[PDB]
């Protein structure tokens, strides 16, 4: 089902991220409810710097946020931003792969080519052709 795969391709990528962050100097074999708790706090954290750094830049009449809008956004969430250059240069740092794409073939359809009929003058040429 590609309908719930719109959400589950990115939430089950955040589950691999928390599973990769709880292994770095830490756990193996965590409880199941403790993983869906922590990946819910992770999605709610990315969605909160999304809403608040957009609010801080648009308060200053801008549309896309700079660095000075996030270092005030993270201050208003209590982050202590200066410890982040040391966290980025870990030797335990890992990369979680992005999710796969549903349309792997992209163009696999031979199609059915049938043309008959024209257009009456109240239908312009850019509308689809009348069928067979």
């Amino acid at each position: 089902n590609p309908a719930d795969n719109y959400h589950l391709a990115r939430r089950r990528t955040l589950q691999v991220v928390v599973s990769s962050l709880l292994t770095e100097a830490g756990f193996e074999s965590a409880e199941k409810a403790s993983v869906e708790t922590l990946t819910e706090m992770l999605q709610s954290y990315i969605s909160e710097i999304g809403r608040s750094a957009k609010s801080y830049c648009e308060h200053t009449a801008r549309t896309q946020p700079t660095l000075s809008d996030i270092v005030v956004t993270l201050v208003e969430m209590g982050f202590n931003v200066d410890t982040l250059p040391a966290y980025a240069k870990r030797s335990q740092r890992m990369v979680i792969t992005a999710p796969p794409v549903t349309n792997q073939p992209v163009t696999p359809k031979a199609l059915t080519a049938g043309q008959n009929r024209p257009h009456p003058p109240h239908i312009p040429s850019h509308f689809p052709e009348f069928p067979d």
Partner: protein, 404 residues
């Protein structure tokens, strides 16, 4: 809510010895807030045009009532986690409640679906709804045929393209058969053209004429719109006949192109075996004809090979229960062809093909029900037909399983 449940929550928190009127006071307050939110989450569902009440509707209904759609955790600080939601908790009633932390990493991530695009079509053409796949659809008077002349011309073009003079013409005509929604009410004339064709096309064994008709049958079957089991009885003999009949042309060469016919033909018959199934009519009838073709004495090495192939793709259990008590007869037939000594007849070619097919089926039939121990000379208890080469085929199957 049940008051008993609220007592369980209260005594699991440190608040013991609560009265019933104290406990009933909790379950009418919280049952109102569930009713207040579900009535308020139905506003987002009706403004969604989705009539679904998704999990995100309660996240906006909570935020509307100035309550954090915070689930499972509540921040009395609020600053880090404001009215933005975290998407809930993916939890179940029948869950395991403990997982390994490397099981979640090693599983493949789901595919991000396609982005939203805008396609246009026609709901109505001057009042009439077209039957495109984007839409739901005394002298007696001189009668008219039930086909239109556009439909009759379409039938003539599709049938003259499906006899395979040009390959691109065939392939489109086959895709046109495979997905025309209005191909019902023309289907008697297609079934009659197939059936009649194979019967006057085996009078002289014209292999292409037959390979094209079997591809037409396969293109008729995978069309989802048309209703086929009214023509299923007519279809079964035509698909079956190409696979096991004698070849009036040359058996030795276009042997393989005839086995490729038997393949795309085993496809239509396999569809007949899997679809259209009621009690004891179709599958058991073709199984009985295949078995009395096999138990047949002095059968043609072409009919024999075709019937062997036909009984071979009957699935997992069919070769598990049928090919078992017959290895000795297969070996004796192979030994007679080998004795010859004349190689003029197609008998030697038929024998080699039959033995190879039987040996491959026997290989997994063995890989499937038993360990791969003693793969050197234990198969000599089964007349030593495939032996170590059969063991190597089983090992290749095991390697494919390891790759999976």
């Amino acid at each position: 809510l049940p008051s008993e449940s609220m007592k369980v929550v209260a005594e699991s928190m440190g608040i013991a010895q609560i009265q019933e009127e104290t406990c009933q006071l909790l379950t009418d307050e919280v049952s109102y807030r569930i009713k207040e939110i579900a009535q308020d989450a139905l506003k987002f569902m009706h403004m969604g045009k989705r009539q679904k009440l998704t999990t995100s509707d309660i996240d906006y209904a909570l935020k509307l009532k100035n309550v954090e759609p915070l689930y499972g955790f509540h921040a009395q600080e609020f600053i880090p986690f404001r009215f933005a939601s975290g998407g809930g908790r993916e939890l179940y009633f029948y869950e395991e409640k403990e997982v390994d932390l490397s099981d979640i990493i090693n599983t493949p991530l789901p595919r991000v679906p396609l982005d939203v695009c805008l396609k246009a079509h026609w709901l109505s053409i001057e009042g009439c709804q077209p039957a495109i796949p984007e839409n739901p659809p005394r002298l007696k008077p001189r009668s008219i045929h039930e086909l239109s002349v556009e439909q009759q011309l379409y039938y003539k073009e599709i049938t003259e393209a499906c006899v395979g003079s040009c390959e691109a013409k065939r392939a489109e005509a086959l895709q046109s058969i495979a997905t025309d929604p209005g191909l019902y009410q023309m289907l008697p004339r297609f079934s009659t053209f197939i059936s009649e064709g194979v019967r006057v096309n085996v009078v002289q064994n014209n292999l292409a004429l037959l390979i094209y008709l079997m591809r037409m049958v396969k293109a008729l079957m995978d069309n989802p719109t048309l209703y086929l089991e009214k023509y299923v009885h007519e279809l079964i003999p035509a698909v079956m006949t190409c696979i096991v009949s004698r070849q009036l042309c040359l058996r030795p060469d276009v042997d393989n192109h005839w086995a490729l016919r038997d393949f795309a033909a085993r496809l239509v018959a396999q569809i007949c075996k899997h679809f259209s199934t009621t009690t004891n009519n179709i599958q058991s009838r073709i199984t009985k004809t295949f078995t009395k073709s096999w138990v047949d004495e002095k059968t043609p090495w072409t009919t024999r090979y075709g019937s062997i192939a036909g009984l071979a793709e009957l699935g997992h259990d069919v070769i598990k229960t049928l090919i078992l008590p017959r290895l000795q007869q297969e070996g004796e037939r192979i030994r007679s062809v080998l004795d010859g000594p004349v190689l003029s007849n197609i008998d030697r070619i038929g024998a080699d093909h039959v033995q190879s097919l039987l040996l491959k089926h026997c290989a997994p039939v063995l890989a499937k029900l038993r360990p791969p121990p003693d793969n050197q000379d234990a198969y000599r208890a089964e007349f030593g037909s495939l032996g170590p080469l059969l063991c190597s085929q089983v090992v290749k199957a095991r390697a494919q399983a390891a790759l999976q």
